[PDB]
Every structure is written in structure tokens, then in C-alpha cells.
Amino acid sequence: FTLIELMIVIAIVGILAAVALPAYQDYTARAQVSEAILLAEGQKSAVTEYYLNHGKWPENNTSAGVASSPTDIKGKYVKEVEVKNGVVTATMLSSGVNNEIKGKKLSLWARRENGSVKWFCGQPVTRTDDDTVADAKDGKEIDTKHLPSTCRDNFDAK
Amino acid sequence: HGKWPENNTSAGVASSPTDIKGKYVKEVEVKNGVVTATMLSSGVNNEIKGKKLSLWARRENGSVKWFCGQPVTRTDDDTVADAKDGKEIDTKHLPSTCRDNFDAK
Amino acid sequence: FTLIELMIVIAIVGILAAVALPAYQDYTARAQVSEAILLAEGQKSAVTEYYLNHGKWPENNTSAGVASSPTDIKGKYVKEVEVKNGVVTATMLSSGVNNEIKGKKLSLWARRENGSVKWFCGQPVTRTDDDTVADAKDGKEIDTKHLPSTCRDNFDAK
Amino acid sequence: FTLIELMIVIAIVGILAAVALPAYQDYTARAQVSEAILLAEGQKSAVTEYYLNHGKWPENNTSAGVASSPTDIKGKYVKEVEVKNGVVTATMLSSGVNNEIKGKKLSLWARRENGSVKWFCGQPVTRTDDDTVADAKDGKEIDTKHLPSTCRDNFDAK
Ligand SMILES: *[C@@H]1O[C@H](CO)[C@@H](NC(C)=O)[C@H](O[C@H]2O[C@H](CO)[C@H](O)[C@H](O)[C@H]2O)[C@H]1NC(C)=O
Ligand SMILES: *[C@@H]1O[C@H](CO)[C@@H](NC(C)=O)[C@H](O[C@H]2O[C@H](CO)[C@H](O)[C@H](O)[C@H]2O)[C@H]1NC(C)=O
Ligand SMILES: *[C@@H]1O[C@H](CO)[C@@H](NC(C)=O)[C@H](O[C@H]2O[C@H](CO)[C@H](O)[C@H](O)[C@H]2O)[C@H]1NC(C)=O
Ligand SMILES: *[C@@H]1O[C@H](CO)[C@@H](NC(C)=O)[C@H](O[C@H]2O[C@H](CO)[C@H](O)[C@H](O)[C@H]2O)[C@H]1NC(C)=O
């Protein structure tokens, strides 16, 4: 006979949350990845200096002169950050993150410019030789959709 | 947090179920993300008082989707089941938008 | 004989407002707290620098090099922000806020990482020693329900 | 002899619409103003930076580094947004709006905090000196009833 204004408006806010659910869920993940990136960076300094001073990429965190323990460079969504031959990889925690990005990671690596180096940011990579890396293809890479426009670099970016 | 709120206080709502009541609603309790609403005993039909429904959600991964239907219990973080017991509001009294089954996806 | 469509629909919008009342009232409070947090932050800079440059936490706002007057770091819902030995506490005004959060506050404190510091955000805390704080247990803490997921830190968080 | 249930219920929905008419008509206007406010903001950035970098308020849009043309910062209910000496005013279109708010506007202005500035939001204002504005009293101000609780600032708010 009457009461449908309360019933529909409680059910439009319910469906509004369902539509606002995936937007906040990738905005959210995309936000948790933007930090793995900040934790990865700032460690470029150590790595850059080590390379320019010696001409060899730092083998591990201790070589680069950073928390000798990967797990000591963690965060809220970051379970750690390891330096492996100049390549700095950031791992996403398992608690406090999206759902399709946890335990997932990215990498920052550089290239000899000769007198200086240039840095790249993208999906996990392994270093082959002092001037070549390759996709750490394995299945734990953070999905392209979660990576900034500034971190879409490919293993062979120059 | 990636975990469903255990109770009202966890969800950050009137720590007391009875504090989320109404004219026909005797309360609303959050039990592991599942929100159940109980029908008062005074001021209602006759075959719906003391009866209730539930709203529960499901991880969409990055977001969640909500369901509305007859009382349900949460089993695991992504599974609930009919709170079969006899106090569910009869299908005839539920909107077309609240006919969801325990296994709706 | 007739007119119940106008009577029920005016009474469903009335009860719709009553159901929409607590949702807007915690969404609202949760919004007024999210600012006390923004006012508290951005003062991390002063405090961080003071600590790293001297190895001692700033005793008060003036030491940290900020509005020497706590009341000078207020807002709409924020009655102020005081720095007490590196701990930055934000107080909720008494006018313009929820109802169960006014005159209530939170704290931001940091911890020596050795070469850098890490910040925490949560319910009011007091500093004991240069690397230890404790619950400013007293009854004026902003209730957990009003605090973001990013500001649920405990006095002993590391 | 009979048919009054159809006659009354068609006439209760008719009067229900008449009662729901003013509610949707201020909820509506109040909604069209909330945007003039969003269009006004986000231009605070340009204005803030211009002031902090030079110590003088941007004279006009071009100075602030925004669509050199006021009319280029319009919307659905917004006919434009002009920056006049740091004061940003938003004008309500003439088509697509309430009825007692079209061609009407509001202003956002700031104040030197010394090292930073604080923003205000309210009824149209004019800038007198670098730290003083005044009511642009003229009759085209959006009525207090249509302004959010967050945009009730007076010319002398500090
Ligand atoms: C740090 O990175 C260096 C990269 O050249 C690496 N050196 C070489 C030649 O690979 C360092 O390892 C050397 O020093 C450690 C010290 O304990 C050890 O002796 C290794 O045998 C030697 O290669 C890297 N340091 C560490 C601690 O691994
Ligand atoms: C709120 O829901 C939480 C869901 O994870 C739940 N935590 C866990 C781990 O189940 C909270 O309970 C925790 O906190 C309370 C606080 O008194 C108590 O210490 C419990 O032992 C602990 O599990 C839920 N909060 C409450 C108040 O129940
Ligand atoms: C600022 O924080 C400092 C933290 O070390 C604190 N110093 C010490 C040793 O606690 C400053 O106080 C010192 O300087 C003021 C200046 O008037 C005064 O002389 C105090 O006696 C002295 O401790 C803090 N500055 C202020 C103004 O309190
Ligand atoms: C932008 O705002 C400035 C605020 O100081 C204003 N400058 C002054 C001194 O008022 C700019 O105007 C100056 O530059 C324009 C450029 O054509 C013109 O030369 C004016 O004479 C000069 O005042 C403002 N820029 C514009 C384009 O108005």
C-alpha cells in the first residue's frame, strides 16, 4: 500500500556499494603497489653508488650497504626488498593487501650509461650480465593493471 | 583487514545489537561480516515477528558483492550457509531484491 | 476509503532517514577523524628532521620548529596538534564534530630505525624513553571504530 | 455506490508528489551547488602555489595557470569559474539548475598563514588587500540554505 521509498533507497545504497566495490578494490591495490615502488626506490642510491664506485653491481643488500636482511626493508604491504646483483625487487606482504597482488612483486634495475646509469621500473627481472636482465617469469609478478604508468618497463628497455 | 568483522563493535557500530533496532526491528547483529536483522514482537504482522533475514558479502578480490536473503551463517571467509532453524522470514514477505540463496555468487 | 499511498511514502522516507542516520553519522565521524590524522601528519617532517639531526626527539612544537602554539595547528574538527617528545597528538574540537569523538584525540609517534625512523598512527600515547612510548590511557582516545585501517597501531608496534 | 479506492489512491500519489516536490527541489539544488564547489576547488592548487612561490595572489586564471578563459572552467550547472586575485568564484549556469540558484555564485579564498595558506568557502567575496576580502554584496550569492555545512564561511573568517 505504501512503504517503498525506504526499501528502494536501502537497496540502491546496497548496490551502490557493490558498484563502488571494484573501484575501491583496484584503486586500493594500485595504492599498495605504489608503495612497494617507494620502498624499492631510495635504495637506488646505494646501488648506483656501489656500481659507479666499483663498476660491478652489488650482489646483495649487504654489498649495497643496506639492511643486510631483505626482511628488514619491509612495509605495510611490503614483505621485503632484496637487492640481487643491482636489481632491487619488492615483495608484497600477504596481510593487509588487495587479493590478487599479495606475495607478488616488482623490480627496479639499472643500466650502465657510461659515467652514470639509468633506472627502470617494472615486473620482476633477473640480471644476466652487467648490462642485461630478463623476465623473472614465474607467475608472482604484480599484474600490469596494478602498476603505475611510470613502472611499465620491459626487461629490454633502454 | 582482509577479515570479516566478528561483531558489531569490530565493524564499528553500536556495540549493542539491540541498539540497532527499529519499529518492527528488534535488532541487527553483525556476526562475521553477516548482518542479520530481527523482527520485533510488537507492531508487526503475525507470521513474521521474531523472524529475521541476513545480508552477507563475498570477496570479489579488491572489492566485495552483497547478497540479501533468508538468515545465513558464515562458515569460512568466503562461504556461508542457511541458518536453518525455523525463524527465517518467509519468502513471500521478502522483496524481489532479497531472494538470495546461501550459495549465490 | 483511499489515501494511504501519500501516508506510507511520507513514512518510509521518514524511516529511511532514521536508517540512513547512523550510516552518515559514523561515515561522518570517520571523516572528521581522517583529518585529525592529516593535521597530525606533515608535522612528521619537522619531527623526523629534528630527531635525525640531533638524535633527540623534539620536546615541543617550538623545538620541532612548528607553530609554537598547539592551538595554532587546529582545524575544523581539530582543536589542535601538540608535539610532546616527538609524539604528535591531535585533539578533536568540540564544535562541528560527531558526538562521541569530540575532545578526543590520536597520536603519531616514531621509532629509531637507526639512520632513519618509522612512523606509527593510533590511539594517544606518551613517550617514556627515546625508543618507547605507552598508552596515554585516560579515556579521551578516539574509539577504534573511528580510526582508519592505517591508524590502528598499538603502543608497542615495531 | 463503489469506486473510491482507485480515486483516492490516484489522489494520494498526486499529493505525495507535491510533498516530495520541495524535498527533491532543495536536495536537487543543494546537489548542483555541491559541484560548483568541486569545480571551484582543485584550482586551489594553482592559486596556492602561485601565492607561495611569489607572495602575490594570482590576478586572473592565466596568472594562476589555468584555462585562461573563465568560461573554460564550466560544468553542467556551472557556467564558469574565475580567479580574481586569488579568490576563485564559481557561477551557476542558467540551464539545468534549480530556479533560485541559477546565475548565482560562491567563492573560495585563502589567507596567508605564513609559510602556507588556509582556504575558506562561502558566499561571493572580493579581495581588498593581500590578506583581506569582503562580501561581494550584490544579490547574486547562492542562498545559505543551498550551501554545505563546510561552505558557510564569512568574509572575515580566520
Ligand atoms: C657484495 O657484492 C660484491 C659484488 O662484487 C661481492 N663481491 C664479489 C666479487 O662478488 C661481495 O662478496 C664478496 O665479499 C663477501 C664478504 O663476506 C665474500 O667474501 C664473498 O666471497 C665475496 O665475493 C658482496 N658482499 C657480500 C657480503 O656478499
Ligand atoms: C572484531 O573483529 C575482529 C575480527 O578479526 C576480532 N579479531 C579476531 C582476531 O578475531 C576482534 O577481536 C579481537 O579483539 C578483541 C578486543 O577486546 C579481543 O581481544 C579478542 O580476543 C580479539 O580476537 C573483534 N573485536 C571484538 C571487540 O570482539
Ligand atoms: C626543544 O626540544 C629540545 C629537545 O632536546 C629541548 N632541549 C632539551 C635539552 O630538552 C629544548 O629545550 C631547551 O631549550 C629551551 C629554549 O628556551 C630551554 O632553554 C630549555 O631549558 C632547554 O632544555 C626545546 N626547546 C624549547 C623552547 O622548549
Ligand atoms: C598574473 O597575475 C600577476 C599577479 O602579480 C600579474 N602581475 C601583476 C604585477 O599584477 C600578471 O600581470 C602581469 O603580466 C601580464 C602579462 O601580459 C601583463 O604584462 C600585466 O601588465 C602584468 O601586471 C597576471 N598575468 C596576466 C596575463 O594578467
Rounded CA-CA distance C116/A66 in Å is 12
Touch between D and B (at least 3 CB pairs under 8 Å): no
CA of C60 to the centre of ligand 3 (A): 8
Q: What DSSP state is assigned to residue A143?
A: P
Burial class (CB in 10 A: 0-12, 13-18, 19+), B34: buried
Q: Cβ separation of B13 and C19 shorter than 8 Å?
A: no
R_g of chain A, CA atoms, integer Å? 20
Strand partners, B58: B65
* Integer Cα distance of C26 and A60 in angstroms: 48
- Residue recorded with cell 536508517: C19
Q: Is the CB of D58 under 6 A from ligand 4?
A: yes
- CA-to-CA distance for A82 and A39, rounded, in angstroms? 10
Q: Chain B interface residues facing chain A, Cβ-Cβ under 8 Å? A: 1-2, 55, 59-66, 68, 95, 97-98
Say if residue B97 is exposed, middle or buried (CB neighbours under 10 Å; 0-12, 13-18, 19+).
Answer: middle
Chain B: residue whose CA lies nearest to C24? B13
Name the residue with the closest Cα to ligand 2, atom 14: B10
How would you classify the pairing of strands B79-82 and C78-84?
unpaired
| Ligand 4 pocket, residue D62 CB under 6 Å | yes
Beta carbons within 8 Å of A13's beta carbon, 6+ residues apart: C20, C23
Question: Is residue A106 classed exposed, middle or buried when 0-12, 13-18 and 19+ CB atoms within 10 A define those classes?
Answer: buried
For B3, the closest chain C residue by CA position comes to C149
Task: Please give the grid coordinates belonging to residue D69.
Answer: 578563459
Q: Which of D150, D86, D148, D153 is nearest to D117 (CA)?
A: D86
Among D68, D71, D131, D80, residue whose Cα is nearest residue D105: D80
CA distance C47 to C25: 34
Residue of C nearest to D2 (CA): C1
With H, G, I as helix, E, B as strand and everything else as coil, classify residue C114.
coil
As a whole number of angstroms, the distance between CA A32 and CA A75 comes to 10
Which alpha helices (H) appear in chain A, and where do they start and end? Answer: 5-40, 44-54, 61-64
Return the DSSP state at A140: -
Chain C contact set for D15 (CB, 8 A): 3, 6
Q: How far apart are CA B28 and CA B41, in angstroms?
A: 14
List, in order of start, the domains of chain A with CATH numbers.
Answer: 2-158 (3.30.700.10)
Which one of C3, C13, C76 has the shortest CB-CB distance to D12? C3
Helices (H), chain D: 5-40, 44-54, 61-64
Q: Please choose from A49, A51, A62, A63 the residue to mutate so as to test ligand 1's pocket, defined by most ligand atoms within 8 A of CB.
A: A63
**C80 phi-psi bin (left φ>0, alpha ψ -120 to 50, beta other):** left
Chains in contact with B, counting 3 or more C-beta pairs less than 8 Å apart as contact:
A, C
- From B63's Cα to the closest Cα of chain A, the distance in A is 4
Q: Nominal resolution in Å?
A: 12.5
C-alpha distances (whole Å) from C64 to each of B14, C46, C56, C69 are: 40, 5, 11, 12
Q: Method of determination?
A: cryo-EM
Q: Are D124 and D106 in contact (CB under 8 A)?
A: yes
Rounded to an integer, what distance in angstroms lies between the CA atom of residue D104 and that of residue D120?
18
Best A4, A5, A13, A81 residue to mutate vs chain C (most C CBs within 10 Å): A5
Q: In D55-155, which residue ranges form alpha helices assigned H by DSSP?
A: 61-64
Q: B and A: touch, per 3+ CB pairs < 8 A?
A: yes
- Burial letters A17-26, b for 16+ CB under 10 A, else e: ebeebbeebb
Q: Which of A31, A148, A136 is nearest to A88 (CA)?
A: A136
Q: For residue D115, report the distance from its CA to the centre of ligand 4, in Å.
A: 23
d(CA A69, CA A60): 9
Rg (CA), chain C: 20
DSSP code at position B91: G
Distance from CA of C24 to the nearest CA of A (A): 12
